Structure 1
Amino acid sequence: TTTVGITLKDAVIMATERRVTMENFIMHKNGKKLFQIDTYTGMTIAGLVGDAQVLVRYMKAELELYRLQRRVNMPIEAVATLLSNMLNQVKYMPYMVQLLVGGIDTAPHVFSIDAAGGSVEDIYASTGSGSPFVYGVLESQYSEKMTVDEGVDLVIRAISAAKQRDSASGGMIDVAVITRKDGYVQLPTDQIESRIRKLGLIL
């Protein structure tokens, strides 16, 4: 399994593939690892399905409740800190998971969160089994002067690469770009597979 959050100009793009497996037994071809968590924010799950899912629901709600009572959307670093508190508070019987939460408030953001509530923001980062491979290509071709369209391609490339060198990852890769203009929008499957073909990639 592999996910990736990438920051650029005035947007943040997040994508993941979706094969869920049990050791070498790839039991589920179409899991979901990308979730909208608020009007202007998304999150990527990676690790044990049980812990991740419950975690997504808590976060999802915790955010909606916050919005209503405060009349304004929770800032990204705030969501990241909240999460950070939850996880660390139970470090000795941790949610075996690794979360990536991207979004845009006053500016774009992307934070990496570990099972101990360690939270750190980067301009891009990957999460999951195939992390290295993507970190390889991103390290090689990412540039903060890219257009949201260039971005969406780089990402697909990044994931398709990890799909090659990592048996744990696989299936249809899916992306969502979140901008202040349009908000959190997930790209149409077709359009994605279209870019794949165009790029001469595979699967």
Structure 2
Amino acid sequence: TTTVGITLKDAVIMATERRVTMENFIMHKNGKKLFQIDTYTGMTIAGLVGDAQVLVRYMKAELELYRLQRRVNMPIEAVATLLSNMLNQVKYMPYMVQLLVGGIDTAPHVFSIDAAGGSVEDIYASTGSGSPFVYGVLESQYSEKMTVDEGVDLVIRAISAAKQRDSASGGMIDVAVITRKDGYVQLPTDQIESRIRKLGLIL
């Protein structure tokens, strides 16, 4: 699998592939690895499927209970801290997973969390099997002066290169941009195909 998350000026973009395997044997050509975790932040998945889905369910529950008890969204540092404490309360029966949470509260963030519960800030991060490819292209082409369209084009080029050069990843890319103004929005697949045909990465 592969994930990607990029912080730019006033927005943060996350995208994944959708191919779940669950054997060697690619088994599901259309999974779901990107999850809206709250009205201003989301979460990606790059590990064991069942453990990852249970973590997504628990974090949805805890953030909704949070927002209702306090009537404000949770800070991104707080949700990363909570996730790290949850993963490090049990590490000798551990969750084999690599998580990546991004969002915006007063400033955009994207945080990486390993299986041992190490949370760390960064401006662009990625996890999964084909992750070094997208780190290569993000290191080569990334600028923090980009717009939202330039950013999502960079993301599509990245995941396209990962699908070209990795066995485990593949399938149709989906992308969701989260900003402070318009909130969480997932791009429709027709727009994604339009950007792919514009950039000339289709075969």
Q: TM-score, normalised by structure 2?
A: 0.98
Of 19-28 and 133-142, more deviation after overlay is shown by 19-28
Residue 193 of structure 1 and its aligned partner are, at CA, apart by 1.0
Say how many residue pairs are matched.
203
**1:19-68 deviation per Cα after TM superposition (whole angstroms, max 9, x unaligned):** 11144300000000100000000000111001000000000010000001
1:40 aligns with 2:40: yes
Q: Once superposed, which parts of structure 1, at least 4 consecutive aligned residues long, lie more than 2 Å away? A: none
Distance 1:28 1:198 in 2: 28
SS at match of 2:5: strand
**1:103-149 deviation per Cα after TM superposition (whole angstroms, max 9, x unaligned):** 00010000000111111110001110100000010000000000011
Q: TM-score, normalised by structure 1?
A: 0.98
SS at match of 1:158: helix
Residue 202 of structure 1 and its aligned partner are, at CA, apart by 2.4
Which structure 1 residue ranges, 5 or more long, are not aligned? none
Distance 1:12 1:136 in 2: 19
Residue 157 of structure 1 and its aligned partner are, at CA, apart by 0.4
SS at match of 2:96: coil
Q: 2:67: which partner in 1?
A: 67
Distance 1:150 1:177 in 2: 12
Which structure 2 residue ranges, 5 or more long, are not aligned? none
Distance 1:201 1:48 in 2: 30
Distance 2:116 2:68 in 1: 29
Distance 2:135 2:191 in 1: 24
Distance 1:190 1:24 in 2: 30
SS at match of 2:26: strand
**1:79-110 deviation per Cα after TM superposition (whole angstroms, max 9, x unaligned):** 00000000011111111111100000010000
Residue 71 of structure 1 and its aligned partner are, at CA, apart by 1.2
Distance 1:189 1:87 in 2: 33
SS at match of 1:175: strand
Q: Which structure is higher in strand share?
A: 1
Distance 1:106 1:97 in 2: 28
Distance 1:71 1:85 in 2: 23
Q: 1:51: which partner in 2?
A: 51
Distance 1:136 1:21 in 2: 24
